DNA sequence: GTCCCTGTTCGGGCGCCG
DNA sequence: GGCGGCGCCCGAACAGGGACTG
């Protein structure tokens with residue numbers, strides 16, 4: 012008993028080339044795919060199938076066991092689709108991998124061609140070995156959709172007996188949220204795991220961190236120029252911001268290091284602006300149709316800032332990701348952890364991942380991001396050269 | 409013969425029909441060879457006589473083979489190809505000798521009549537019809553889109569059991585070539601080779617003895633493989649006295665091929681000899697710098713050179729060196745002076761850049777190439793100071809990173825040639841710079857106003873707003889003292905100069921870079937334009953005469 | 955909207971391999 | 973004179989994004 016799956020109205024399947032894999036990952040993928048072929052979950056195909064999506068492997072946490080990850084982003088974009096507001100308000104949320112359950116449900120035959128992938132070869136000893144899925148694949152939009160009726164059957168008694176718990180499925184994982192003490196919450200999660208077999212997230216600390224203005228008892232012309240520039244940018248977000256009185260303090264061709272006392276007329280204006288950045292942005296409504304945009308700025312020394320919005324200057328959420336200021340800091344590793352954290356937060360809040368603007372050259376990211384990826388999903392991303400002013404506007408003290 | 413392997417189902421793109429092209433006229437020298445081939449092929453069941461039942465046709469021809477005494481039969485299947493379904497190409501790259509491990513016993517086999525030993529989809533043979541007599545293909549024809557992939561896949565399926573039950577044997581499968589390596593003594597290796605030949609025979613595939621290499625040096629993939637050295641086959645550079653665009657392309661392509669084992673190859677000038685050309689039959693005069701670069705390349709090529717094989721128990725070391733003008737050479741090796749291979753990176757990215765960005769790009773290219781050949785990232789040896797790199801990684805607002813490396817003091821060292829102050833400078837004169845240009849008139853003005861009362865405005869013609877902003881900064885830098893603070897309203901010029909470039913394709917930016925290098929302290933600050941911020945407003949009023 | 959600048963992609967040559 | 977793979981280098985086409993005109 013299979014479900015027919017239609018693609019986009021006028022689009023084809025994925026034709027994404029397979030990128031190079033390290034020997035470690037190739038060996039793991041070959042082991043995993045041998046085991047999967049035996050069990051009938053995948054089968055060998057040839058070049059007559061014109062489709063391809065990339066595959067790699069990630070080593071799980073505190074484990075020697077690798078995990079096969081298929082980048083189904085192109086496939087997910089091209090399969091036309093067929094969220095609890097209170098989960099973000101719970102005290103604890105646990106993320107449970109429920110992916111392999113999909114391997115019980117067979118995949119529609121006509122659609123199988125679209126799930127083709129190609130295991131590569133070290134030094135191209137052989138041509139690539141091509142496979143396709145016979146069951147619901149981990150990482151594809153349709154797998155939790157098709158499995159949803161079975162999943163609701165699985166979760167009906169647990170929800171009935173535990174009405175205070177919030178269970179939300181996003182593609183390969185369940186998000187289980189509650190307000191119980193840590194230990195009792197863990198025991199309930201173990202109840203749910205035993206239920207699944209029978210067949211570390213706190214959304215309170217998630218602070219919308221504001222834009223803060225420098226506090227000084229002595230202001231140079233340079234300082235006031237920086238402040239007027241920042242406020243003129245921020246008025247694109249908070250229109251009530253005035254600069255007139257501060258801007259008047261600069262009349263003349265003064266030295267940058269010259270000290271400027273703040274007139275009471277301008278100090279009141281600065282205080283007004285400081286208070287204005289405290290109240291929220293008006294006219295900001297979430298739109299499920301339009302997708303989420305997440306910008307990231309590297310601030311330096313383990314500090315990163317991010318904004319999640321849909322239209323420019325109507326930020327749904329701003330935030331920072333703060334890692335340790337270490338000697339051997341890995342910018343790519345930090346950026347990867349940051350995009351994972353932001354994507355988790357978006358899946359919890361809005362129920363969809365954002366398209367990322369990544370402040371990095373495309374090649375560095377494509378070369379190293381897999382070395383630090385740990386989630387079962389993958390967000391969409393593009394690569395932008397962040398302007399020197401946006402970082403200055405969102406940085407902290 | 410014909411392999412008993414299952415056929416690979418092929419369709420035409422939806423709605424298309426087979427080709428109906430008429431046969432191009434040929435000489436007798438090709439008709440004779442094609443008849444001699446087609447009679448024996450139709451006897452062997454590889455092609456079958458078609459009647460008036462097939463309405464399709466495609467032109468055929470023949471060319472001399474690598475050995476000029478045998479003819480290869482080709483078919484101009486361009487129409488059918490355009491009408492045939494899409495394939496996923498399975499050959500993902502080109503195996504490299506440096507990724508080979510030392511082996512006690514080596515064999516190279518060539519499969520005989522490779523394509524003509526793999527059957528073709530029955531519902532698809534009707535579209536392959538040709539005429540000299542009207543035949544149709546029962547096997548893979550040469551010139552059809554689908555034949556390389558279908559052969560590569562069938563060869564993989566055929567080899568699969570032999571690989572399964574001989575894990576200690578290495579088989580490099582390049583499309584009909586088979587490199588076979590083992591650590592077995594010569595006798596048992598020859599036994600296994602016989603097993604592999606008889607196994608290919610059971611699947612319809614012949615290994616003729618004439619193309620069965622048994623003793624080193626083995627010829628493989630364009631290289632000569634010796635027991636623990638490997639070389640490239642000779643590279644004959646043309647000595648043409650008048651140079652055409654096609655000749656430059658052949659020369660640069662041969663130089664690119666040579667750069668995999670010959671160190672220090674440069675092609676930037678010879679390649680720039682192409683900028684905005686017309687066709688393959690335009691004579692190009694060699695510039696003096698191009699003549700010198702070519703002489704250097706020649707002197708490199710007249711030197712004995714070899715590579716070695718990969719040892720998985722020792723480290724991968726990639727050492728990079730800076731050539732001039734965005735060119736870089738590298739050597740990958742494991743034991744000093746015993747190179748696995750060499751390479752070059754000379755791609756120019758960005759209108760404005762510095763050597764730290766270029767080096768990062770090279771490190772990325774070498775990393776991905778190393779993962780492809782050996783499956784490891786190498787350990788790097790870069791001509792950049794650890795302090796230089798940290799300073800860059802601090803001041804740079806993009807995420808950048810380089811894997812494990814150690815400094816090597818082989819000039820030219822990679823350096824940042826200047827730094828921008830993080831704070832305004834006490835005692836430094838403060839220049840407010842600006843510029844404007846009229847879109848219709850194309851005329852503009854650039855200038856500066858200082859806190860000490862200096863004013864300068866300079867007229868420019870055939871300029872833009874952005875060029876006029878860069879010119880204002882240039883004026884300030886020229887006229888300032890060793891320490892200066894500069895206040896601009898141009899996010900464009902700001903972004904450029906903040907990126908700390910040391911080279912540019914804009915002459916103005918280069919002059920700006922030279923001035924920035926000459927200074928001792930520079931502080932660049934930004935104010936929004938048209939906001940009445942003094943004294944940006946005074947410069948703005950001064951440079952707006954249009 | 956326009957103009958200017960800049961980065962990405964892709965197709966066209968050639969090189970090497972079969 | 974045909975095909976597929978990879979490589980290089982160039983220019984044409986195009987996609988943001990900042991700044992501008994009345």
Ligand SMILES: Nc1ccn([C@@H]2CS[C@H](COP(=O)(O)OP(=O)(O)OP(=O)(O)O)O2)c(=O)n1
Pocket residue numbers: 473518519520521522523524550551583584616619972975
């Ligand atoms: N320029 C080329 C070279 C090869 N090919 C294809 C891909 S591999 C196949 C090799 O040709 P054959 O099977 O007839 O074998 P050979 O030509 O090597 O002779 P023998 O080994 O003596 O039987 O032809 C091509 O399409 N274009």
Ligand SMILES: [Mg+2]
Pocket residue numbers: 518519520521522584
């Ligand atoms: Mg052959």
Ligand SMILES: [Mg+2]
Pocket residue numbers: 842843877897898937
């Ligand atoms: Mg200006």
